Amino acid sequence: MFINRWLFSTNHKDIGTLYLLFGAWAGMVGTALSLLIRAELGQPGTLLGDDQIYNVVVTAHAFVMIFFMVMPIMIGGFGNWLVPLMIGAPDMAFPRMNNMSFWLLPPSFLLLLASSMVEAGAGTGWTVYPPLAGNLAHAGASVDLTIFSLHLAGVSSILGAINFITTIINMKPPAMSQYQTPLFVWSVMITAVLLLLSLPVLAAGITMLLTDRNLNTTFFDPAGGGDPILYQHLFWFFGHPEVYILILPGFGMISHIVTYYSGKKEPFGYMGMVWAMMSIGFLGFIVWAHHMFTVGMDVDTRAYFTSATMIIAIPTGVKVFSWLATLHGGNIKWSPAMMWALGFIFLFTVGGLTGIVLANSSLDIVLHDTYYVVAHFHYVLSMGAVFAIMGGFVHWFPLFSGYTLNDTWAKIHFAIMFVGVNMTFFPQHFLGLSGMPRRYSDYPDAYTMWNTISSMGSFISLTAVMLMVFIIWEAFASKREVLTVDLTTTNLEWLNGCPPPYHTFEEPTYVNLK
Amino acid sequence: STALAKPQMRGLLARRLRFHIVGAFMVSLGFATFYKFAVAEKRKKAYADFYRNYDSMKDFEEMRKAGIFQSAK
Amino acid sequence: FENRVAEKQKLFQEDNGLPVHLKGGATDNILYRVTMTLCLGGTLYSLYCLGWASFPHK
Amino acid sequence: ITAKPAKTPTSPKEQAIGLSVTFLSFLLPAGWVLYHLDNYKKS
Amino acid sequence: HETDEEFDARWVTYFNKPDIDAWELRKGMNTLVGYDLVPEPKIIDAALRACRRLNDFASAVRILEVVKDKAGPHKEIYPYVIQELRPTLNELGISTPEELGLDKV
Amino acid sequence: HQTHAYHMVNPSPWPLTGALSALLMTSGLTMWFHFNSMTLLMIGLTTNMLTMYQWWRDVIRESTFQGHHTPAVQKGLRYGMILFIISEVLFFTGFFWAFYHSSLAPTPELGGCWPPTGIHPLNPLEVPLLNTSVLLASGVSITWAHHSLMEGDRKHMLQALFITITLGVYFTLLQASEYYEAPFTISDGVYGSTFFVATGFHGLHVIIGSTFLIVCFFRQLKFHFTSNHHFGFEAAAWYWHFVDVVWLFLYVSIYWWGS
Amino acid sequence: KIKNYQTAPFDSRFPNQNQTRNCWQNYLDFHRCEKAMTAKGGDVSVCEWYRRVYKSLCPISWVSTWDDRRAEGTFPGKI
Amino acid sequence: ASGGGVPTDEEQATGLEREVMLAARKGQDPYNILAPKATSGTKEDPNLVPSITNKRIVGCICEEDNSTVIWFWLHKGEAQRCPSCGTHYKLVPH
Amino acid sequence: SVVKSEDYALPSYVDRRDYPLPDVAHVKNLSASQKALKEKEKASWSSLSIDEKVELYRLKFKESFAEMNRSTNEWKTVVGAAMFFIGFTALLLIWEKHYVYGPIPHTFEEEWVAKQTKRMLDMKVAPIQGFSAKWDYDKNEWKK
Amino acid sequence: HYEEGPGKNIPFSVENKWRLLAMMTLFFGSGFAAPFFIVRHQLLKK
Amino acid sequence: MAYPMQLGFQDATSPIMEELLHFHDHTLMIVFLISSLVLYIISLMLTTKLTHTSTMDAQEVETIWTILPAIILILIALPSLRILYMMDEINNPSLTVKTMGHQWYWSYEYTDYEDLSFDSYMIPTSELKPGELRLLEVDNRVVLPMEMTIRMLVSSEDVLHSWAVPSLGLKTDAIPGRLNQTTLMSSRPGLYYGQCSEICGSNHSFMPIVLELVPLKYFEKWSASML
Amino acid sequence: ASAAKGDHGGTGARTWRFLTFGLALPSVALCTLNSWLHSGHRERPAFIPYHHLRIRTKPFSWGDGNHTFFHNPRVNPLPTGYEK
Amino acid sequence: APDFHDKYGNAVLASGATFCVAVWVYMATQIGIEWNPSPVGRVTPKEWR
Ligand code: HEA
Ligand SMILES: CCCCC/C=C\C/C=C/C/C=C\C/C=C\CCCC(=O)O[C@H](COC(=O)CCCCCCCCCCCCCCCCC)COP(=O)(O)OCCN
Ligand SMILES: CCCCCCCCCCO[C@@H]1O[C@H](CO)[C@@H](O[C@H]2O[C@H](CO)[C@@H](O)[C@H](O)[C@H]2O)[C@H](O)[C@H]1O
Ligand SMILES: CCCCCCCCCCO[C@@H]1O[C@H](CO)[C@@H](O[C@H]2O[C@H](CO)[C@@H](O)[C@H](O)[C@H]2O)[C@H](O)[C@H]1O
Ligand SMILES: C[C@H](CCC(=O)O)[C@H]1CC[C@H]2[C@@H]3[C@H](O)C[C@@H]4C[C@H](O)CC[C@]4(C)[C@H]3C[C@H](O)[C@]12C
Ligand SMILES: [C-]#N
Ligand code: CUA
Ligand SMILES: [Cu+2]
Ligand SMILES: [Mg+2]
Ligand code: NA
Ligand SMILES: [Zn+2]
């Protein structure tokens, strides 16, 4: 029974649970790697070794946080638990293929851990650029194990995208149009389209890297007429969509959280929110070379990519102001999930604005490959994607488990994390503007003050991560069972109780056309 | 004894919003003026003042005499 | 050839509680055991190979 | 949300135990490695 | 849309329906308090008399509480509304939340 | 009992065995490239084939033999197959991008010209044109097979599907011969790299598509398809047309324009 | 000779940040010219402008490698 | 040119596929493939909600093109009203 | 009174200031005296006593508005506990400085820094605003 | 078929909170420890 | 170079870097204004017991929410693109210098006249002279004439690197097989520092750039003495 | 385009069989004729050890590490030239 | 009836604040951390050459 249920699953809730457990374990790995980074940098000099061990840690930090924590938690975890419930469907379209999307991830993670154990690891950056990632400067198996880790993670997500798109298009009540599905369901559908189109291009590029390393091709090697910059285009054709994949399910969860704890039946401006997510998804495919403003592209290309990148602020601003307009007039419940979501609105806005700074190719000459970029993306990742994850986790934990968290502890956790992430990353703007490069294990002495403060901030975030584990233990230890949940008339995923039965919607909802 | 007067009872949230969005706008202007004066113009004037009578050869000779250069003793 | 789909429909709808991957009969169990043994054994072997590759040789 | 009182209440003493054990599970192994870094490098 | 007076009159008519049922009483009050306004005394008067016809003393008191709540920090609105309702309160024997001690935390 | 039309699938081991097969194939390629050994890779390829066989076997059991493919389920599988093909189009798009990047801006190492100095391309009017006629013809014959099936004509469905498969095999044999005869190799700089990786992934997809057609051929021999319900045939035909269209783009881009 | 060369002038054929082809073209032009001139009984001095430009723009290792490959018979540009 | 030998769905469909096919021929929708058409929704003329148990979830799209659906359990017994628009629904278990 | 997990699909009671009249009464079962009280409620409410009126309210509702809206001392616990855990973090940093970090480079020694500062001023590091602009070259001291 | 309800729809037991504490400690602690021990591994090599 | 506790950009040494400072000031004012407005509106939405929970019409307010940001973006893009095209303008250099990145140091070639080239390595911390800067000094500086337009050509002979000098507003990637061009013009004599700006392996942190800007006559004699 | 055929009254099985045997397979037969006609080995060119060809940055994982997967001795020189 | 925050909130606030300030002041000043503040107004420049 245990093996049938948990290794042979065809159930969207159990698979969602598996993803949440996997993502939480990955989050611990990713947190440890982040502390090793900040320990190396928290005083001038060398702690661990030279830049190879240092950038193996940096590279794994990024891959773990992106591919094994954020995407599994948002898409595999919250997506599998919530999407079928929110449309009244009895499971996903392909419930058995869904299970293989999950089980590809432990092997993917094993490959990544193997890459770091063999030889001297893959010290390449998560972008894996050649020639540093090629077979002369990174001889041996580490980069090939990284490539294969990405192949498996990509297959997992491509099949998952097929599943989500099919489920959301095909398995709604017959009276429900796409414009009657909740915003979180929209956010997952759009993320899935981005995954479907972008990951195959990454797969092509890293397969090219694999054959340059092992089959004597020369896609990226000038000696054979190849070009290192071609790899950068193929990687970033995926990589910019990827950051919208990391944030869009978060936007969906934020819409639901802000609506719920405002005591509203609906988000402000539903069709504008749909429009904004679609627009962001589309524009996110035509801007990738803003990751390449210093590689030597023609000026008119730089001007196009500056302008097209900046226009993404318009649909994103509609979402920010619509969240504010959802709060407006609300009966505000100051729950811990609401605190995460309010932190998200502000700190995501700050990070998105420094992204607009970076979109200016002229200024990006000085900011590129500096900590200003690191500050931008951790505002939108540690204070954006992660704040949406924590808000969603706190909000829906009682649904998934049937038990309540201690809200006072959860507010304490939010407070500690909020201090920690801002102490970590706010000073990195100063380090970037004053010219500290990325991917450095040590820095000129002038940069010492802000690196010391940033490292102290990272230890505060460690304390918050440790406290989160205790808080989850305390909830399962005390077993306070849920009774009543408000606002079920506009939050269908709660209407089958907490936790919902293994099979829900065996008899579908009744919705007439009218 | 006297009756209480009828107060405004409708649109209290909207009235509050209107008043404070206006206030936010006026402050935004006040801050933009402060910033152009305290930051942007300060910088333009610092660079223009610095270069207005700047003598690059005199600067070089000072540096050279301090011993900073490989190419100039 | 003759159309024997009806016979297969009877077999795979027999009310015996078997999951579809075993419902064909004892051959399914054998092929399942072979597949799972190769997968689990091969995975242990891959872990051994990691162990081996994680340390310098000579 | 409303909920039942805890079926298995976790007293303050019990929470102090769970919290201490949780923190030590993170801090002792990493602290052991970091304490012995020089032994690893200076070798 | 419609004038204030047209709005107030629709709501008075709603609660004045002689055979208004319990569901319609709750639907009306729970809808009304979603708007950006404190209901006019004449609306509250009609809702209280609907409570009387439904033999529901407790909901009459609750309606008085929600009037105070919808006024937010505008502390002058609730005493005004109670003042305007005192003939109805006296006629129907409705005690205010304050007279019942239900304003104590 | 359910009162929706969707398929609650029995708990299955094949997702786990497929995921483990992916671990064994990738760690196996690593062992082959770096530790001189094919053992893991061979186990992985074997478990992958076993997984694919039992998984799709079970889908046939669930549909032909158990009746779970209602119209709603079939419609989902149509979307699934279309989306899968789209992902495969984007995979090939990356290799076309690599080809055009390198050929439109030939670097000094190549002679600053395309084709590179020292490369003697195949004549696109010889076996490459023959291969084009072969796959185009097979798109006509698979369309005949589809209409025969819809019209309830068992014998001509089988004849047309056999001709389609024969043409897929002919393409594969011709392409294998061309690979052997080609005077340039995958190690002949970016010309050989783009040529063999792009046409090689295409050849793999011809083999996959031909296998899928063969599965359909034997299911047809066993009377699985009705004149109205035959999604596996439809999916194989869609995949086959995708393989044909990718070939036409390779022929125009790499063999003709790139010569 | 319309000299006083300081460095290679702006060349409208190569107006962008990537100057690889500017180095390459002037290297080819110099050696093409030198081939013509040595051949027909003429003076390589007429080729001098291309020589100065490619020597200004081209990395030493590129010139060195291209020279080696011309000596070996493996230079892939047409001269 | 043309011949036979391909089974039809009438001959060979089985299981749930066959149940759906046969019910559709009869104009019946036991597996909820179609959207029900609303009645006027008064207490006299409530929307009739079939169920194989004593409660079913209703979603009410109160007005055409609303994006918000209002969800609630409908129980066997007296008709219930959508909490947003008041339109009436009555369970018809079978 | 007692709410049960198996009741999740039934109309439920809630105290929310924006949903003043919930879907069910707080108390559904009535004792003999409570029944008699509901009968008396059908007569003039002027004849109900204050206590009877309170009892009717508390049969219908759980908490009053004032009760459901009350503030709490929870912020003291949250802020105080958060400061405790932030304080605990500094213990980790003290441990790290003591047992993990070795000496920092010799370039932070006071004499080194004094010489390096002079050399920065000699090469006029950031002479417009950032650094040497803050040095008075005429008076040979930091500007006031 | 399977157990339903709080504490039953998860692959780990919550029947005893102290056994649970141990399991959660091993689970989250092993993920957090792994990078430190890989760093140790890479340092001890060379 | 950067100095302790620095918050913003290194002081400008070139006219283009001064342009970038003023453009950054303009854009940061906008960033601060929008961030502060969002924080303020958040606090405004959260500080009243007044409620309005019925459906709200979105159409009118979304015109403001799209048109005002579009105007702001245009007000950023215009000066942004002006500077972009300025940086691209034809300028007629007096000198061309090449730099090749390597693991882990830079080489420099000045081959307009003579074949002058040399390697430039970080000074190890243990060998710094008193008052020299840890991780920033090199053994052989890139001596260049001040007040003159210089064409810098950048490439690599191994992996990617990137050649940066923040105070001149310069960062050009060093890509094998590719010759990237930038222009350099220092308004002042002095010493201007940069650091390798593309991850390049074990000693990426430890291959810095030091430009030494002096009068032409000193540059000429230094060049001759380096042959 | 309409190409130059006709029919479109009923695109059915009979029409697609007509296209298969009347257009598609004759085209294959023509191109097969054309191909097995220009076949026969063209003469291999002088070997020149161009550095952008015969790339070897890592030995191949088969054979002696120096032979491509479908190495044809007649037309594929090694980095050192044609095989004997 | 008084809850945990009524009974202990004041003490948690006071003790937490006191502990937090004390330990961060100690860490910042007593254990040899090099903050590398600006030399401006602080360092007397000394001859180096
Ligand atoms: C969740 C992740 C995430 C998200 C959502 C984003 C969102 C954005 N990012 Fe970012 N980014 C990263 C993660 C993310 N980014 C990462 C990881 C990197 C580094 C990659 C690597 O090199 O490793 C990076 C790097 C990166 C660069 C490359 C810089 C360089 O390397 O030199 C650029 C350049 O244009 C960029 C820009 C943007 C912009 C314009 C947005 C926009 O989508 C933001 C839009 C949001 C707003 C603007 C705020 C809300 C709007 C309003 C309140 C309306 C009014 C606003 C205005 C009028 C301006 N990002
Ligand atoms: C006949 C038509 C079809 C042919 C297919 C034959 C076998 C190849 C299998 C197909 C895989 C396709 C792409 C693999 C990449 C390269 C193979 C390209 C096609 C091919 O077969 O290329 C051959 C070289 O093969 C080599 O190196 C062979 C290398 C053998 C190892 C295969 C590659 C191993 C790595 C595979 C990585 C797969 C990554 C998958 C990513 C999926 C992501 C979602 C060409 O032979 P040659 O002697 O150089 O020149 C001919 C000279 N007379
Ligand atoms: C039940 C599920 C299935 C579980 C599968 C477990 C299989 C384990 C068998 C491994 O055998 C090893 O294989 C190595 C490589 O395969 C051999 O190395 C050899 O292999 C190379 C390849 O032929 C030679 O070239 C090398 O000299 C030599 O080291 C080596 O003798 C042997 O120890
Ligand atoms: C970034 C994540 C971690 C950052 C913060 C870690 C906080 C440290 C927690 C304590 O870790 C322990 O510290 C002891 C020292 O206090 C070490 O004992 C070591 O030192 C002792 C005292 O000198 C000896 O008694 C022991 O034998 C010797 O192992 C011990 O091994 C280690 O587990
Ligand atoms: C025996 C069988 C009749 C099928 C059935 O009615 O049972 C016939 C009908 C169609 C035949 C196939 C088709 O005519 C196409 C192929 C023609 C080749 O000449 C032989 C194999 C070939 C694949 C045939 C095998 C066999 O004779 C088939 C399959
Ligand atoms: C941003 N990417
Ligand atoms: Cu060179 Cu980094
Ligand atoms: Cu991007
Ligand atoms: Mg870079
Ligand atoms: Na360090
Ligand atoms: Zn309704």
Residue numbers in the entry:
A (entry chain A): 1 to 514
B (entry chain I): 1 to 73
C (entry chain J): 1 to 58
D (entry chain M): 1 to 43
E (entry chain E): 5 to 109
F (entry chain C): 3 to 261
G (entry chain H): 7 to 85
H (entry chain F): 1 to 94
List sentences from the manuscript:
pmcMammalian cytochrome c oxidase (CcO), as the terminal oxidase of cell respiration, reduces molecular oxygen (O2) to water, coupled with a proton pump across the enzyme molecule from the matrix side (N-side) to the intermembrane side (P-side) to create a proton gradient across the mitochondrial inner membrane. Electrons for reducing O2 are transferred from cytochrome c in the P-side to the O2-reduction site, including heme a3 (Fea3) and CuB via the two low-potential sites, CuA and heme a (Fea), while protons for making water molecules from the fully reduced O2 (i.e., 2O2-) to 2H2O are transferred to the O2-reduction site from the N-side via two proton-conducting pathways, D and K as described in Figure 1. In this paper, the cyanide-bound fully-oxidized, mixed valence (three electron-reduced), and fully reduced (four-electron reduced) forms are abbreviated as CNox, CNmv, and CNred, respectively. X-ray crystal structures of cyanide-bound CcOs under various oxidation states showed that the O2-reduction site controlled only the Ser382-including site, while the low-potential metal sites induced the other changes.
